[PDB]
Amino acid sequence: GVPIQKVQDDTKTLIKTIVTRINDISHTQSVSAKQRVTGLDFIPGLHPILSLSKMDQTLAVYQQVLTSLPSQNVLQIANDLENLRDLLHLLAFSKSCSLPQESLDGVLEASLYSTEVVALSRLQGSLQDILQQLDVSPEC
Amino acid sequence: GVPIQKVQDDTKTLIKTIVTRINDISHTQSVSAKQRVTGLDFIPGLHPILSLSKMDQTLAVYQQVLTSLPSQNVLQIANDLENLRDLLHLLAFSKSCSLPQESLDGVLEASLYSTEVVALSRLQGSLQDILQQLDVSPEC
Amino acid sequence: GVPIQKVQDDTKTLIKTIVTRINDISHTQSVSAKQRVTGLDFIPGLHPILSLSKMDQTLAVYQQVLTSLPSQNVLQIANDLENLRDLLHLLAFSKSCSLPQESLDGVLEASLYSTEVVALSRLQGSLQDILQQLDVSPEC
Amino acid sequence: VKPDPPLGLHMEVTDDGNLKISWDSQTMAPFPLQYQVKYLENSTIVREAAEIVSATSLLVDSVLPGSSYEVQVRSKRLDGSGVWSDWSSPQVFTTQDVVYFPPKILTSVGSNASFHCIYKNENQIISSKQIVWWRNLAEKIPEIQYSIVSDRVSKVTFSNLKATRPRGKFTYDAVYCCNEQACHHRYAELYVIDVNINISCETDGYLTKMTCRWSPSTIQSLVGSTVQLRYHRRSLYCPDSPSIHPTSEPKNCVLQRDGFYECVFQPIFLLSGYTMWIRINHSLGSLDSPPTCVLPDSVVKPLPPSNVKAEITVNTGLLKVSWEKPVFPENNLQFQIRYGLSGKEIQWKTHEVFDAKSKSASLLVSDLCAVYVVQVRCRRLDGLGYWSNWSSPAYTLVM
Amino acid sequence: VKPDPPLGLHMEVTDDGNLKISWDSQTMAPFPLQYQVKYLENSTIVREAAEIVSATSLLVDSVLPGSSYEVQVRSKRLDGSGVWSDWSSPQVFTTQDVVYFPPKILTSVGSNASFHCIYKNENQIISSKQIVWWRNLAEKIPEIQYSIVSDRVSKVTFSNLKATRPRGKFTYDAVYCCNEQACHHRYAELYVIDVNINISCETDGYLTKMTCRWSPSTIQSLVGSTVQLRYHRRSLYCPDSPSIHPTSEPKNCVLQRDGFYECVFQPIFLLSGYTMWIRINHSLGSLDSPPTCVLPDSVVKPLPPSNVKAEITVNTGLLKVSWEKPVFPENNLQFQIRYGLSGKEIQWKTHEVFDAKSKSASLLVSDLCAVYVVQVRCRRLDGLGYWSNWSSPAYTLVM
Amino acid sequence: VKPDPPLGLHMEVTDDGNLKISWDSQTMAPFPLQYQVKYLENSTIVREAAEIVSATSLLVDSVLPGSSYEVQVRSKRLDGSGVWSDWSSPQVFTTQDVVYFPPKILTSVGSNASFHCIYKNENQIISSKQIVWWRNLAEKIPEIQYSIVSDRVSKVTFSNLKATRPRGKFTYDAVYCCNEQACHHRYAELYVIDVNINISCETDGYLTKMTCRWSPSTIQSLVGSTVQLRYHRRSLYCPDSPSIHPTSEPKNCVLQRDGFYECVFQPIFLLSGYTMWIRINHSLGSLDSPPTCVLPDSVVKPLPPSNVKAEITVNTGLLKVSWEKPVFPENNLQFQIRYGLSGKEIQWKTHEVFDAKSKSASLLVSDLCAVYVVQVRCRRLDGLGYWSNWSSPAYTLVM
Numbered sequence A, B, C: 001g002v003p004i005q006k007v008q009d010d011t012k013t014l015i016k017t018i019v020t021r022i023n024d025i026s027h028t029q030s031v032s033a034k035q036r037v038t039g040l041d042f043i044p045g046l047h048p049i050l051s052l053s054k055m056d057q058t059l060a061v062y063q064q065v066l067t068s069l070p071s072q073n074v075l076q077i078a079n080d081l082e083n084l085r086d087l088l089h090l091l092a093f094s095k096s097c098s099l100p101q102e103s104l105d106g107v108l109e110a111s112l113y114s115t116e117v118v119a120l121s122r123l124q125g126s127l128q129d130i131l132q133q134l135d136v137s138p139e140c
Numbered sequence D, E, F: 001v002k003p004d005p006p007l008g009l010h011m012e013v014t015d016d017g018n019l020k021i022s023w024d025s026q027t028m029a030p031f032p033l034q035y036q037v038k039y040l041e042n043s044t045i046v047r048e049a050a051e052i053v054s055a056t057s058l059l060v061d062s063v064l065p066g067s068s069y070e071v072q073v074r075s076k077r078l079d080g081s082g083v084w085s086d087w088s089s090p091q092v093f094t095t096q097d098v099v100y101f102p103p104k105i106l107t108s109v110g111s112n113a114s115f116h117c118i119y120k121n122e123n124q125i126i127s128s129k130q131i132v133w134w135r136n137l138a139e140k141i142p143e144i145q146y147s148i149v150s151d152r153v154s155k156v157t158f159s160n161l162k163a164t165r166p167r168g169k170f171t172y173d174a175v176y177c178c179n180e181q182a183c184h185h186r187y188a189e190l191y192v193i194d195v196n197i198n199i200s201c202e203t204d205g206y207l208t209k210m211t212c213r214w215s216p217s218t219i220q221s222l223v224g225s226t227v228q229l230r231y232h233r234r235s236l237y238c239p240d241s242p243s244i245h246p247t248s249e250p251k252n253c254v255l256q257r258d259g260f261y262e263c264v265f266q267p268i269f270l271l272s273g274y275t276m277w278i279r280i281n282h283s284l285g286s287l288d289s290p291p292t293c294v295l296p297d298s299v300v301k302p303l304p305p306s307n308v309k310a311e312i313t314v315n316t317g318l319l320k321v322s323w324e325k326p327v328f329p330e331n332n333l334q335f336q337i338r339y340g341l342s343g344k345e346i347q348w349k350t351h352e353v354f355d356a357k358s359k360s361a362s363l364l365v366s367d368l369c370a371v372y373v374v375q376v377r378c379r380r381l382d383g384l385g386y387w388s389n390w391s392s393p394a395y396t397l398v399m
């Protein structure tokens, strides 16, 4: 009933869409994604992203962070993350496996620019890695 | 001073004018004027209207009914009836003779459509009769 | 620093300006300035204005009168008169000399047209006299 | 009962120059009241008077210039053992050095108007043979127009008044009454307005409403006062000479983008006479335009003739034009047909049909093989009305 | 506890023709109440009844025409030794001479609808074989549509209903049920509306919002009732057959001058199924249009191709047109180029490019020395979407 | 007297980085109070201090990053055997990991600005030889701009500042001070705004009011802060170099449809110097544009020449143009006449008249029998002002 190849292609197209949107955020493109910045250690930066449950909780944390950032673009980005997470949840149903489901506010008030730029460049790195490994048979 | 033949011609022209107006009310033309409808028995339908006092009280009752219908058309026909009553008063003055001068709400509220269609087709019939007898020497 | 000949020319230009303004007030040009009119005896009309301190207190009174007329033109004339007073103060400073600084409401209310035309034509006459004597060695 | 003192004690100067003292009657008293007014005129002579009146007003003869009136009033029941109220609070009214009779006159172009004046000079009323009248401090009025009402009252009479030319914001002539060469500041205000405004009405083709238009080009200059239309409807027809009926009602008229006001009467009474005029509500009074009476039946604009057809009659070559008379009016109508060659520019020729029963005409045409364009309009045969609009164009077929 | 008597005793006629008696529950009672209703139906036969109910309402079967209902209620605590309240004040409810079952029906075009009626004629139920149905007092309904439910209940059945044509302010058909020749003034209201409204949605070029447009030309006639758009979002994609989900939410949309309503969803869920329909909340009930499901990804309007250039190749004279594909969509696109001689009137010729990897095309041109104007637009190769707007005009250089 | 404890205890960081403790003086005390402040700095070292001050505030030197200050104050009557109040409620102030000196700088284009910072890394103030400065986390600031104030305080100095380019809603540059490779999220906000706004004023042709226009295109980006025009009027004339007077007043300006602000001065003082500027009242302070002084007498735009006539002189064939100089100014003026053949396109020729007493000029014309169009404009002979508008066209009569 559900054609898995169309869904996989839609996942790649949606990934390319989120990546181009974040590439359009000019201030983030000139910021080193892999550079670690103190205070935002809760943000899931470059750290082998190798399993379905960690990806789900990663996109969940990134979503929770974006909900608090007051930009309309970030709101749209959060909606794209909702559709993408549900697509990975349906893919996990396709492969058969269960998936279960603090200081960020302080930095949002004290350093909104930093919180945004870092969250976005680390998000950009996470999506490039997930994309580069969504074809080498992802497993639960 | 007052030309009685002129006033008589204005009376005929006003009657034909009101008849054409009521003829423009499409839903009433297809309704049998002489057909009896229970509830509107107080409305003075077809019964030889051969005298000035009965003609006057008939147009007065029809006016009293029309004053309560919230249609603009009904307002103009009632205003034309005011001009018509003044012409009948002037003709009675011309021939020399004196002319003296409740349940409507319930039927108006419960059945406005019926009150309107009946009042108008019965009024049209009364006016058609008056026209056919405004030349056989009308008497007070 | 302050060119005294320039200041004399600016004084002449401002006086001629006020006289031309009053000349543009059509209703005042046809009124005899020297004609006595009962009620405005408090108005400093034609009376040898022969000293800098007397000119200053006269123009001060004229300013106080103009402040009460609800006309925009009279307001502008009072502002120009303020600049004129400052120019006469600078001229007295140039020549070295110190310069210090009721029934009007009733006549303003009962007869505005006459009070206005008179106040203005007497002002125009006073300025024409001061102009005619601002070259015969004016003295403090 | 002890009634209260009368309230609202006011004092005005009448057009005759008398002091009218007025007060509010107690609207709650179920019985007639008599009043006693005590007043003290502090002039060059102090005079105290106390008068008993049954009216709610007193007239005091001849306001003295430069005098002060102090006034109190008390009430008593007229019928019976009435106790007097206490006195009102004293009210003070201060008169002025010149007095005008009347102080202002509001009239229209072409009328005759006359002013009276009293000049007090150091507490002394001068002789009328000394009083001189002046206009806007500009020109002396010819002595021919002066009139000696009495040894102390002067009069100026203007005839065939011409419209006042506005000087700046001043739309009135300031008329001064002077003691020989020396004038005083107090003047009289004279307003002459061109009240000859034309109101035109037109009833719609459906006989359901009447739109009346009028231009306030005369009055788009006087501010402070209001201008509105009043009307009165007579049960049947228009009088031979219209008049201003004492009982009237105002009609709300709306100003249009073209600067005209438009007021629509709906519903209408077709055989009822509508008399309308413009009433000018000035602070000093009211002005009325010449009244006009319009009968809606005589201002009807009919709809154009319908179902207009034009065919070239086979073999005969006549332009047979046919039409259907409009639903209204029922009166016998006359028709006018315009016809021309179909082109970029149509040279219209017209033919007039004066018999109401003609639903068709036959016309001679020069080119049997051209398309003719034809339109028709209608009017009441008796001329009592307007011409209809031209019908929608009808085209011949080339055969 | 002795509770108080129930308050607010009201009586309504249900759509089925039953008498619904209701009362306010005591919001202060911390325990369930049982009620006893006593009612007296004064018809041609007096009937007294006393019923015990745990609900705050009672249904009495089949309101009798020309009867009077007198009602009292008392309360008691349901659980325990409850004392009864005193009885409520008696409330009177007066029924009417004709009864309709139901009194009104609101349906859509093409449906089947049937009315039942009861006719009381001088306190006598006539035979059902006598009732005849009429429409708007204009025409007798064919007896084929009549059905004898019982000896006293008549039924009229309409099939394949056509939209009711509005006569003046009347937007419903008055269906009358008459006793042979004599009809009554009371009628039933039948409203048949064309609910087949089409809603069209378009997602902006940045895929950040979706604007949906719809025309209420069907419903710009019914006043009193409200019309609003309702929607429900499904996590992913559209079902094979859309349905009205029981759980939905309204979206506030604003009417534009073009007469269409425009409602924007922002932010959007690109891969979530948006099911929308128009809800007509009338006093008589609610009506829902046939639901439609739209996937925003499939209604995307891409931005036009950018950096469009046109150059004449030296010596060869070919028109080289080049462009840059829009940022979105990522799917393979097809392009359409229009080109023409630069003039007051551009004779556009079009060329279609169906290979996604083509960033340029080469065109044969007739005049190597004229300025050509060229524009390009794009569309999804699979056709699942709209055409983009035309690019900004590109001009050739004269070489 | 035993006074009450001080109230309103607040703690702020000064732009210099000191902790200012403040409290409300008891407005009801008819005698001077002395205070004793007790504070506990919980840093890496606990410090307890108790100071006696006669002022209602205390400055504590150099706020330590990552420390907590707890503060209590008590009061006593200054003169005599005063009993001490009880201690205030303890107030807690929590410092942050990095401290900037000052935390924000608002400056204009072309200025020099420098920030100082202290970085605590695991409860240790690091050495100045490792701190490196960055701009918006994008690029390392050249070490040339760094300055070692001391072994623990770093300084960054920017010279000839360029306007900050806004990135999205961010209108400031985030300047970061980092411990070698590792930066922290806390940054300093640097706002560089182009305060070089030009205000242009123009006096009306009637010399009754002066209108000043300015564009807020610079400031239609900063929200939260307010922008208003301030001015100060000097009795006579403008200074050689305008300055920001300490005493000024605000002027209510209205934004126009073109996006410009208009400030209307009415009435005006022709010979009074009006010094005006734009004030940007931001949460962090106030900014003033370079002040300008305008003398309305020097910005007058005269009315065009009036009564312009053009006649062809009989027998001689000269175009005699004549005019009346505008009412103002009375000072000697120069005139410019344009004349041309009356057509759809007028080939204007111009003649300049430099003598103020010339009310007419005579021009050579090629065709004596054509209608010529003529217009005249004027300007102050000394050039101190603008040119008037062209007069209303004058046409010759063909004679």
Ligand code: NI
Residues within 6 Å of the ligand: none
């Ligand atoms: Ni009468």
Ligand code: NI
Residues within 6 Å of the ligand: none
């Ligand atoms: Ni579901």
Ligand code: NI
Residues within 6 Å of the ligand: F234
């Ligand atoms: Ni100074």
